[PDB]
Design a protein around this ligand. Structure first.
Ligand SMILES: [Zn+2]
Lengths: 244, 99, 41, 157, 122, 115, 267, 355
């Protein structure tokens, strides 16, 4: 410390006798907090089956640190939807979350925080899956809002939305997923294809029967598929020119 | 006609600049060939999905048969994993007993 | 004097200002007031 | 400019002669044709665009009354929405040369009396009309109308 | 049966594009014994791709043989022993998954204990 | 040499451009002085067409030299990209045969797909 | 060298442009004045076209002169194979890029174990390039290799792998003691400064971002390529706000795929 | 658990998704493009700016502007992408003049998706986004003029061109004609408003042609001939004439150097001493000459080329200073004169002559 000149912090760090009780209580705190985090992740993997959720605990721990990697992928599309991955750094009284896209969030030791966080991340996954699926099927992504700001107020976190268009024009598909009120999904037909559309006498040309004026809503149960993205893929294929 | 054959023709068209007897010619040819190739691939996938949708609404017992098959493969795969793990555990018990 | 300035970072010159006030009868509740400031020393 | 100036001086000296292109032809075509070879081998549709893109809340139709197929056009709209209450139909007078100018709302004060609620609709609507930017569309008027109906529902209850 | 043939036909088109991408990567890396090895890999990839095309035409003919309902009539807008077989296998792998969760939890706890006890020895 | 030929050809090119523009202006002024009613000396009018083709000949020499030098330098770059002379001929026939093998593999299997 | 290739192709197009522009001057003068309704308008059009053509000739001559200032200096079967090889290589590069941008693979399913010697060979191969990065492998705890990547006089990164796949990273400053009392690596610490905790967070997003499923060599190579860009910390300004300091922080975000500096508040 | 304060999160999300449109509304109003205001679009969970009339254009006929502004239906702007700074304009046109062999032969409403991203400086709705949009609309207009002329001339076409080429792609931003007997080659025309030119780009798409397009030697003069007079049938005529000569000329060795002059005036140069002009002409006829001589003073010779003795007699077999006058051929005698036959090493006839 004399010749290689040290600051206050290194000097105090060399001489800091922390008792046995503080060390043992910090270890027991980390054990309990880590067990609670594992329990909430496994409870979400048991209860919710709609996206999916995975975990990969690290090989190496300290007495005051562990780590996971949480993926949230849909069931049969693990190459498409790889856009929501987390890393949690379970300290002594804090869980520090690093997202894939550079968002760092420090939670607290309660197990309601981690539950609401992972619920909001499943809700955002249900939209990023449709965006990267419309990337594959050639559909054109008209609008995408990661945290939408119109409509009813969601309790847990914000809600996300896209709208994509069919590659040959006519049909459109809008998804709005939220963590408490999930998946209001609705197609948009062209005009001259609703036929309950009350026509107006101002339109005197037939060129305006090609714009997509009407909007109907798909009932999401009774749609065939054992998944969400599977149902979206069947819905996207249904609104294509029937190639046979 | 017969989207398979358009897929075959477009795939053979991707290679047409190489198999015969600078940069921008190669670039525009590659872009047009690859775009038509992927477009016909997506149309073929759309055809198979439309046919699967019509089967899943008309003849739903086939879907249940495939689900039965997949759950049975999940069962057999789980048992294979646990058997390999159990053999490794017994080997490690025999190792750790000998200290 | 109990306020919170939330600057939007994708577009600066835009602030959401939360002012917290005491509701008079309930001593364990707060009342929020949200303002929208804009800014150009 | 540089290395090209005497051509520019000759041609700018000799503009406005009627035999100019004759002079250019005689001095330039034999050289070029020797080297390069021989030569070469009712309603304005802006309103239809607005009406075709409206939300199915509105039900815009032309007035049976008023001049038709002439400069300005006249509209009687409607409002259908479970959330919103039934309201007086609203009358619009769209000028010819519709963009670059603002349409006018034909005011009917007498039907916006005889209720407190329609009075609140009317007051709030004139307020948002004063708040509007200039050269607004038809859809700006219709959306201020729907927002005015919504505020007059909320302010009342 | 046929509703798994559609799945196989989708997988063939998904494999053809990926295989062409791998072919173009092999042609990217080829620098004028490993010469002959890259030749063998190229020829084998091309063989498998021709097999995939023949299989695809087979699956196309099989599914196109075996429609009375047009699409866009199939989407819900707003306004029997095999089921018991499904329930049987569902209950079976419910129990299997819970036992697998117990095995996984005990392995996690053993790994955490080993790392903690070995971390404190220094 | 091609860089130095290029340096040789540049001022000749500027000279041909100067003479071409001045001779064009002289011939145009003479033809306008005949076409409009004007006296003008016949003189050493020095025809336009020879200057135009001379300029084209100089541009052909320039593009010839540059295409030659560019082919030479691209040639040397790919030659360095790829010590007894029979060892040279062995690796050269090796390279030719290997490229032939890639080409015939691609052709035979792109034909083996259909037709 | 390639700069001579580019300058020669450039000056080739300069000669072609000069010749065509001279011929365009004389062709537009051959046709003569057009009609163009207004007499004033036709005079204006003819004068403008002639002036533009003359200016284009002057520009082409000037560009040729500038290239002159900047210029520097059975057998056919082999050259044919050489040309066809370069053609196939460039064609395959473009087609591979276009196809792996848009893959149709949805799942790996249809219808990790590595020798540590292989890990050492891979990481020494990465250490041979990037002469300012030194990577020092060690294995204090089993097969999981731990790497100290020093970076200039700027960073010391502790990378904790697991079977040749990056798992955890910790970025500390140069002077900071990365060693414990016993001289082992301090795998679990933080770096006393705001900047390097931000760079640990960005490095964890970097290892979450560069994920190929199977092949891990591209992952480690790309992670080190991204990490190499941090040598211009404290010297690069932010590409959004221009300044160096937002809330007393340098731009800690080197963006993936285009290694540009940003303050993370400027996304 | 009421510790979330949902109202503040809603207000922050609402400001951050709505306020990008306000700058766009101001920048649209400064260039006086009439638009309906920022509106909720269809479903509740979106936003859009729909234009009404994009300001006419600069430098196209009024027939083309009346044909554009009766073919447009809608030009919405939407905001998408992460950071919420990627605009996409969705133009939708009715009454498309010509279809393609790509299956856009459906209902006559084509959708063109333009996408813009401003930098991280110069904020999300700026002068730059609307300037890029006006340049893209200008490009669509200045190619729609040529497409209107071509689709007008399509029923009365010289009928050998009608076998020669069919249209592959018309996006309103490109025009990709695919020509050849086997339809293996392709031109692509596109206005480029940086240089304010057209760009002709050549490619080989189809399994019967050479290793190149074979018009790539004459590409610069093709682009210049198109920029002087933008007519597609002129372009098809030039390709139809010069394809059969150039397909032979590109099979020459390289000794032989190919300087294209003006289009249809390829000029070959053997080593350095010998020159030979080639003029493609109509009806499968090519006239060749001596090169080194003048087209003016017969006695004088060109600067770098020495005259070839006996050239006239050799050309006559296929059919003093009298090499200077041209000698027409058939394109088949040009095939024989240029494709390498073994000798009456596989050299050409012509290079045997000059050798
Ligand atoms: Zn910044």
């Amino acid at each position: 410390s004399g010749p290689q000149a040290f600051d206050k912090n290194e000097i105090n760090s060399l001489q800091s006798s922390e008792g046995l009780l503080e060390k043992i209580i910090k270890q027991a705190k980390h054990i309990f907090l880590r067990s609670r985090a594992a329990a909430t992740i496994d409870s979400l993997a048991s209860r919710i089956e709609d996206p999916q959720i995975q975990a990969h605990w690290s090989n190496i721990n300290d007495v005051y640190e562990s780590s996971v990697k949480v993926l949230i992928t849909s069931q049969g599309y693990e190459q498409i939807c790889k856009s929501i991955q987390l890393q949690l750094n379970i300290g002594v009284e804090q869980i520090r979350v690093v997202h894939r896209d550079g968002r760092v969030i420090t939670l607290s030791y309660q197990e309601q925080e981690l539950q609401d966080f992972l619920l909001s991340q499943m809700s955002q996954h249900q939209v990023h899956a449709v965006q990267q699926l419309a990337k594959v099927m050639g559909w054109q992504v008209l609008s995408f809002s990661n945290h939408v700001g119109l409509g009813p107020i969601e309790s847990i976190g914000n809600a996300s939305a896209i709208t994509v268009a069919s590659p040959s024009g006519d049909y459109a598909i809008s998804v709005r997923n939220g963590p408490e009120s999930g998946s209001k999904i609705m197609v948009q037909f062209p005009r001259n294809q609703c036929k309950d559309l009350p026509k107006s006498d101002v339109l005197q040309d037939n060129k305006w029967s090609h714009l997509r004026g009407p909007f109907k809503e798909v009932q999401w149960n009774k749609m065939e598929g054992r998944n969400f993205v599977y149902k979206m893929e069947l819905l996207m294929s249904a609104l294509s020119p029937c190639l046979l | 006609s017969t989207l398979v054959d358009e897929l075959e023709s477009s795939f053979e068209a991707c290679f047409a600049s190489l198999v015969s007897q600078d940069q921008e010619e190669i670039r525009t040819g590659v872009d047009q060939c690859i775009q038509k190739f992927l477009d016909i691939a997506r149309q073929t996938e759309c055809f198979f999905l439309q046919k699967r949708l019509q089967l899943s609404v008309q003849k739903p017992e086939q879907v249940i048969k495939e689900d039965v098959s997949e759950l049975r493969n999940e069962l057999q795969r789980k048992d294979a994993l646990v058997q390999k793990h159990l053999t490794k555990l017994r080997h490690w018990q025999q190792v750790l007993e000998d200290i | 004097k109990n306020k919170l300035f939330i600057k939007l970072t994708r577009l600066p010159q835009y602030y959401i200002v939360v002012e917290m006030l005491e509701v008079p009868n309930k001593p364990t509740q707060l009342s929020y007031k949200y303002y929208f400031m804009s800014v150009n020393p | 400019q540089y290395l090209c100036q005497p051509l520019l001086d000759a041609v700018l000296a000799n503009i406005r002669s009627p035999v100019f292109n004759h002079s250019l032809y005689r001095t330039f075509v034999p050289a070029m044709t020797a080297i390069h070879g021989p030569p070469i081998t009712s309603i304005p549709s802006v309103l239809q665009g607005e009406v075709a893109r409206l939300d199915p809340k509105f039900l815009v139709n032309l007035d049976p009354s008023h001049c038709s197929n002439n400069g300005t056009v006249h509209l009687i709209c409607k409002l259908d929405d479970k959330d919103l209450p039934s309201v007086p139909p609203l009358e619009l007078s769209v000028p010819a040369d519709y963009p670059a100018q603002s349409p006018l709302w034909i005011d009917r004060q007498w039907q916006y009396d005889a209720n407190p609620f329609l009075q609140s609709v009317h007051r709030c609507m004139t307020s948002r009309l004063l708040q509007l930017p200039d050269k607004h569309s038809v859809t700006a008027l219709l959306n201020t109308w729907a927002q005015s109906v919504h505020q007059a529902c909320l302010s009342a209850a | 049966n046929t509703a798994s043939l559609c799945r196989i036909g989708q997988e063939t088109v998904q494999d053809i594009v990926y295989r062409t991408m791998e072919i173009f990567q092999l042609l990217r890396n080829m620098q004028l014994g490993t010469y002959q090895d890259r030749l063998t890999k190229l020829q084998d990839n091309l063989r498998q791709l021709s097999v995939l095309f023949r299989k695809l035409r087979l699956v196309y003919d099989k599914c196109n043989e075996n429609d009375p309902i047009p699409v866009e009539q199939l989407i819900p807008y707003v306004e029997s022993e095999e089921r018991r077989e499904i329930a049987e296998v569902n209950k079976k792998l419910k129990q299997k998954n819970q036992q697998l969760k117990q095995i996984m939890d005990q392995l996690r706890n053993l790994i955490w204990d080993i790392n903690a006890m070995l971390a404190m020895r220094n | 040499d091609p860089v130095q030929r290029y340096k040789m050809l540049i001022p000749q090119l500027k000279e041909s451009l100067q003479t071409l523009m001045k001779v064009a202006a002289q011939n145009l002024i003479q033809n306008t002085n005949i076409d409009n009613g004007q006296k003008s000396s016949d003189g050493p009018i020095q025809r336009f067409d020879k200057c135009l083709e001379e300029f084209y000949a100089l541009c052909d020499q320039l593009e010839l030299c540059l295409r030659l030098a560019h082919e030479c330098l691209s040639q040397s770059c790919d030659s360095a990209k790829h010590l007894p002379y029979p060892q040279y001929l062995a690796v050269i026939k090796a390279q030719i045969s290997c490229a032939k093998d890639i080409h015939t593999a691609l052709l035979d299997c792109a034909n083996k797909v259909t037709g | 060298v390639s700069v001579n290739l580019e300058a020669f192709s450039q000056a080739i197009s300069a000669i072609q442009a000069l010749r065509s522009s001279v011929s365009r001057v004389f062709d537009c003068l051959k046709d003569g004045m057009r009609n163009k309704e207004t007499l004033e308008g036709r005079e204006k059009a003819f004068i403008a076209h002639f002036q533009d053509n003359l200016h284009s000739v002057n520009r082409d001559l000037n560009e040729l002169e500038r290239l002159s200032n900047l210029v520097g200096k059975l057998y056919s079967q082999l050259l044919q194979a050489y040309k066809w090889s370069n053609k196939l290589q460039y064609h395959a590069g473009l087609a591979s890029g276009l196809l792996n941008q848009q893959s149709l693979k949805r799942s790996a399913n249809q219808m990790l174990v590595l020798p540590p010697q292989y890990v050492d060979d891979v990481i020494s191969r990465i250490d041979r390039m990037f002469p300012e990065m030194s990577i020092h492998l060690s294995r204090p705890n089993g097969t999981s290799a731990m790497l100290l990547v020093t970076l200039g006089k700027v960073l010391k990164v502790i990378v904790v792998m697991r079977s040749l796949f990056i798992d955890r990273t910790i970025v500390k400053g140069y002077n900071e003691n990365v060693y414990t009392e016993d001289g082992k690596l301090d795998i679990w610490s933080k770096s006393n400064y705001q900047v390097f905790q931000k760079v640990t967070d960005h490095a964890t997003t970097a290892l979450l971002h560069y994920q190929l499923p199977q092949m891990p060599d591209v992952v480690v190579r790309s992670f080190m390529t991204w990490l190499r860009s941090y040598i211009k910390l404290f010297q690069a300004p932010c590409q959004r706000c221009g300044k160096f300091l937002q809330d007393g922080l340098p731009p800690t975000w080197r963006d993936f795929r285009t290694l540009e500096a940003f303050h993370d508040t400027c996304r | 658990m009421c510790a979330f304060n949902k109202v503040l999160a809603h207000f922050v999300a609402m400001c951050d998704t709505n306020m990008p449109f306000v700058g766009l509304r101001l920048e649209l109003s400064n260039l006086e493009i009439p638009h309906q205001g920022v509106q909720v679009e269809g479903d509740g969970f979106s936003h859009a700016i729909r234009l009404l009339k994009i300001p006419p254009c600069k430098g196209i006929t009024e027939e083309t502007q009346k044909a554009l502004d009766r073919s447009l239906l809608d030009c919405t702007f939407r905001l998408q992408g992460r950071n919420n700074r990627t605009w996409v304009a969705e133009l939708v046109f009715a009454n498309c003049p010509l279809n393609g062999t790509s299956t856009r032969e459906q209902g006559p409403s084509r959708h063109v998706y333009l996408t813009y991203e401003n930098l991280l400086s110069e904020p999300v709705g700026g002068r730059k986004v609307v300037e890029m949009f006006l340049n893209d609309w200008n490009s669509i207009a200045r190619l729609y003029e040529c497409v209107l002329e071509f689709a007008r001339s399509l029923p009365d076409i010289p009928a050998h061109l009608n076998i020669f080429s069919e249209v592959r792609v018309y996006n309103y931003r490109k025009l990709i004609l695919c020509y050849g007997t086997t339809k293996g080659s392709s031109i692509s025309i596109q206005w480029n408003s940086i240089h304010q030119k057209f760009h002709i780009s050549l490619g080989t798409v189809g399994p019967n042609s050479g290793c190149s397009n074979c018009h790539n030697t004459i590409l610069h003069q093709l682009q210049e001939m198109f920029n002087k007079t933008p007519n597609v049938v002129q372009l098809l005529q030039v390709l139809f004439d010069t394809q059969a000569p150039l397909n032979a000329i590109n099979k020459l060795p390289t000794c032989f150097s190919i300087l294209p002059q003006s289009s249809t005036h390829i000029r070959l140069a053997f080593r350095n001493m010998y020159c030979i002009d080639i003029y493609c002409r109509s009806r499968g006829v090519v006239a060749i000459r001596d090169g080194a001589y003048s087209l003016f003073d017969n006695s004088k010779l060109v600067e770098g080329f020495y005259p070839a003795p006996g050239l006239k007699t050799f050309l006559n077999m296929f059919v003093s200073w009298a090499a200077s006058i041209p000698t027409i051929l058939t394109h088949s005698a040009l095939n024989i004169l240029l494709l390498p036959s073994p000798t009456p090493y596989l050299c050409s006839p012509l290079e045997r002559f000059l050798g």
